[PDB]
Design a binder for this molecule. Sequence first.
Ligand SMILES: [Ca+2]
Ligand SMILES: [Ca+2]
Ligand SMILES: [Ca+2]
Ligand SMILES: [Ca+2]
Ligand SMILES: [Ca+2]
Ligand SMILES: [Ca+2]
Ligand SMILES: [Ca+2]
Ligand SMILES: [Ca+2]
Lengths: 184, 184, 184, 184
Amino acid sequence: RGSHMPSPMEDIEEILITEEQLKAKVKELGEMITRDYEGKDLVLIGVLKGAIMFMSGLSRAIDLPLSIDFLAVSSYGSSTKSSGIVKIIKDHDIDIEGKDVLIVEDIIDSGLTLAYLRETLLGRKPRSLKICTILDKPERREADVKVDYCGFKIPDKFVVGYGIDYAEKYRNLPFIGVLKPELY
Amino acid sequence: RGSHMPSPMEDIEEILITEEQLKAKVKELGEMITRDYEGKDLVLIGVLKGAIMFMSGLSRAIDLPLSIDFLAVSSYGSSTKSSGIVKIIKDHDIDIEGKDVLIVEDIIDSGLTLAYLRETLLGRKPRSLKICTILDKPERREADVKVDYCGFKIPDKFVVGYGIDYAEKYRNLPFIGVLKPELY
Amino acid sequence: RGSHMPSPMEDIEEILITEEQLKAKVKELGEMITRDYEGKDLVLIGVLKGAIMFMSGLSRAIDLPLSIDFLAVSSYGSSTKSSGIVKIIKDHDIDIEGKDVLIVEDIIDSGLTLAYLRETLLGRKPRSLKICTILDKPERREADVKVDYCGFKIPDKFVVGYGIDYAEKYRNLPFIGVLKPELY
Amino acid sequence: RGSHMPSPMEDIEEILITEEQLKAKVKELGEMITRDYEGKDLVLIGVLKGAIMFMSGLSRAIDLPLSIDFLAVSSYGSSTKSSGIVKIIKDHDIDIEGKDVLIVEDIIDSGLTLAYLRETLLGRKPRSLKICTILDKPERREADVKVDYCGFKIPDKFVVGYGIDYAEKYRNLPFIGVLKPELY
Ligand SMILES: [Ca+2]
Ligand SMILES: [Ca+2]
Ligand SMILES: [Ca+2]
Ligand SMILES: [Ca+2]
Ligand SMILES: [Ca+2]
Ligand SMILES: [Ca+2]
Ligand SMILES: [Ca+2]
Ligand SMILES: [Ca+2]
């Protein structure tokens, strides 16, 4: 029988963070941000496409009159890997000067690209600029970035899910799972 | 006392569709799409930024190895209003030729811009092209568009929430609500 | 001695069209277009980056109150080659509805991508849409495109110059030349 | 008689810089750059759409194996005026790290946007970064920018031509002229 077992879940070796754990953490972070940004001009900026799930969940967990925007970027080649420099394919449309920007990330590891985007956004004179990520791989750090809000710290395993892909697949997994080596 | 009442919920006159109703409908639609697209090469394409909430929820409710992509568009002026013609600010990166594309929309009313995007995507030779929207205002139709999957049909009220904005605000409301006229 | 001979001209096997021939043809075409578009709402649209030299020269040879705009595109992969389908990286900003658009091309060979862009522009309802190219390789045609204005017809040789590149180089040659096989 | 006098030249009050003067200056600057960048990895980067005429002419006057690229930008509103901050609509595709970049400008007045783009390009680690402009209005300066190559210094008159527009018109004038106040 050459039938298939199509569910993306079949390609996962183990679940590191469950859907419920993600849901609870998003609620937690959102309540914190609601308190911290009262009276502020909050703009959530996420980097497509990995940030979509966390952006959606986190924003709905923040009880404030915030705005949302996105950046779409691409690599210049054997340069983005060691410097974190990226090309802008879609820039944010909201004028962030004098506003309180919160970068919303899916995962932070080397911190190289994040540091580069941080400097680019700072160049637009926001009143404040902070960072929030649902996942962090501290052991992978190659640059100094301050993570103001962090969901979960995990080891450097090959993960996918909740927006994180592998060749554009697995973003729709409702949890963070370790991808079976046979797939990569 | 000049204190404020910052919650975006305070600007809502009435809730048309609750968070729970949205959650249940997304689960329902996702289970249907999971069945209908088994064996297909599913690519969900949403139009930023309104489609973010529905895209996130619907994708996670589809138990298939799908890919996600986005389009970011803008108006040409007093032309997009009567023809639905739009400028492409961010095109999709995934090659959809020979694939099964499902347009994911936040709301469909006139259907003008949707019809225009549909024709543009058809020009890229996908194997199939369907449309799914969480909200539909049938009375507003100005063009003939077939909605393959539809969450809720609503009257032509001024709504915001679940990704739908008013001057970039209210996208983070977890429900679909009618905006108080004082705000617009 | 390992000294170099840096001039891009050293990489040319033969000159097919001289700088003077190009200059005279641009003047000729511009005078024709000046006559044909009197009273029209002329918008010259070129595809970056190859069209830059011809766009600059042709526009300055047209004695009419025209506007200029550009499209920047990219390939989707093993699809643009047989269908001419392309991704839009930079769309034109000018609203061309009801206007008289003249596509300005560097070279036309298969006509596949040109045909695709033509259909895309027609979708924006211009009053008229014509095509002008400085170079044409008729033997390479794979689609039916009408060239309203044409500078020179040439055999299918490997050419560069006057905006036409090879790995981003040679666009600055003031003539159309055949590239030495050793370079490609 | 309600006949028109369509030539863009009819809207010019006086010619500040003739076509021949521009041609000679472009030849001059190009010969200088040819000498200065021998052995360098020259990348000319211009800001659309005003830089098109000068980019075309200057590049063809440089006898070196250079590459050309462009940036397309937009304003964020009442912010770009005092800070020079701009949104990126089209970023350059060439990786400029370790390369010798020459910004090619149509006109420099306040220097605000130029200074902002300069900082953005420096962030991509080019080996060297210089600036070349065909026109300069020194009295308009609001920021400190070093112009390595300059064609002509002019008073702060309302000019158009050689790529410089007024409501998208006049870019095709072969000279730099003062626009009649009746048109603006
Ligand atoms: Ca599998
Ligand atoms: Ca990311
Ligand atoms: Ca309120
Ligand atoms: Ca929409
Ligand atoms: Ca050589
Ligand atoms: Ca071309
Ligand atoms: Ca006039
Ligand atoms: Ca400029």
